Amino acid sequence: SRVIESLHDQIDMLTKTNLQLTTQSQNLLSKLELAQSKESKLLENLNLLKNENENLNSIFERKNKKLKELEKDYSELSNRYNEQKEKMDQLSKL
Amino acid sequence: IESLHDQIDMLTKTNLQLTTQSQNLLSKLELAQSKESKLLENLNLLKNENENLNSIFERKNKKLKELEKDYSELSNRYNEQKEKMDQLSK
Numbered sequence: 380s381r382v383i384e385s386l387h388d389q390i391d392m393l394t395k396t397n398l399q400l401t402t403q404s405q406n407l408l409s410k411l412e413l414a415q416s417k418e419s420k421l422l423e424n425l426n427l428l429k430n431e432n433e434n435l436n437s438i439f440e441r442k443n444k445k446l447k448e449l450e451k452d453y454s455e456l457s458n459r460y461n462e463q464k465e466k467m468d469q470l471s472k473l
Numbered sequence: 474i475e476s477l478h479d480q481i482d483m484l485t486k487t488n489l490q491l492t493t494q495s496q497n498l499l500s501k502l503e504l505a506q507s508k509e510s511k512l513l514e515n516l517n518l519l520k521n522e523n524e525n526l527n528s529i530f531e532r533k534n535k536k537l538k539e540l541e542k543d544y545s546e547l548s549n550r551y552n553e554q555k556e557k558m559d560q561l562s563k
C-alpha cells in the first residue's frame with residue numbers, strides 16, 4: 380500500500396511530462412507550418428517580381444534594337460551632309 | 474506491482490517518442506531558419522546590384538536627353554543654313 384501510491388506518484392509525474400512534451404509538439408507543428416507558409420508566400424512574390432523583371436528586360440531589348448537603327452540612320456545622314464558639302468565646295472572652287 | 478511497472482514502461486516509451494518528435498520538429502525549424510537566412514542573403518545580393526544597375530541606367534538617360542537636345546539644335550542650324558542657300562538663289 381505504501382508501495383502502491385508511492386508508485387502512483389510516478390505515474391502522475393510521467394503523465395505530466397507527456398502533457399508538456401505533447402503541447403510542445405503542438406506549438407511546433409503550428410510553427411513549422413508558419414515557416415512553410417511564409418516560404419510559399421515568399422516564393423510566390425519572387426516569381427511575380429521574376430515575371431515582372433523578364434517583361435522589363437524584353438522591353439529594354441526592343442528599345443535597344445530601335446536605338447541601333449537610329450545609330451545607323453544618323454551615321455548615314457551625316458555622311459550625306461558631308462557629300463553634299465563637297466559639291467558646294469567644288470562649285471566655288473576653280 | 475508488476476502491472477504498474479509495465480504501465481510505467483509504456484508511459485516512458487510514450488514520452489520518449491514525444492521527445493523524439495520535438496527533436497525532429499526542432500531540426501525542421503532550424504532547417505527553415507537556414508532557408509530563411511540564405512533567402513535573405515540572396516535577396517540582399519540581388520538588391521544591391523539591382524540598385525547599381527538602376528543608377529547606371531539613370532545616368533545614361535541623362536546623356537540621351539542631352540543628345541535629344543544636341544540633335545535638335547543641329548537640325549535647326551541645318552534648316553537655317555538652307556534658308557540662307559535658298560536666299561542666295563532667291
Ligand SMILES: [Dy+3]
Nearest residue numbers: 433436437440
Ligand atoms: Dy530576352
Ligand SMILES: [Dy+3]
Nearest residue numbers: 447448450451
Ligand atoms: Dy549601330
Ligand SMILES: [Dy+3]
Nearest residue numbers: 448449451452
Ligand atoms: Dy532606317
Ligand SMILES: [Dy+3]
Nearest residue numbers: 461462463465
Ligand atoms: Dy566623297
Ligand SMILES: [Dy+3]
Nearest residue numbers: 537538541542
Ligand atoms: Dy525627352
Ligand SMILES: [Dy+3]
Nearest residue numbers: 539540542543
Ligand atoms: Dy549640349
Ligand SMILES: [Dy+3]
Nearest residue numbers: 552553556557
Ligand atoms: Dy529662319
Ligand SMILES: [Pt+2]
Nearest residue numbers: 463464467468
Ligand atoms: Pt554648302
Ligand SMILES: [Pt+2]
Nearest residue numbers: 554555558559
Ligand atoms: Pt544649301
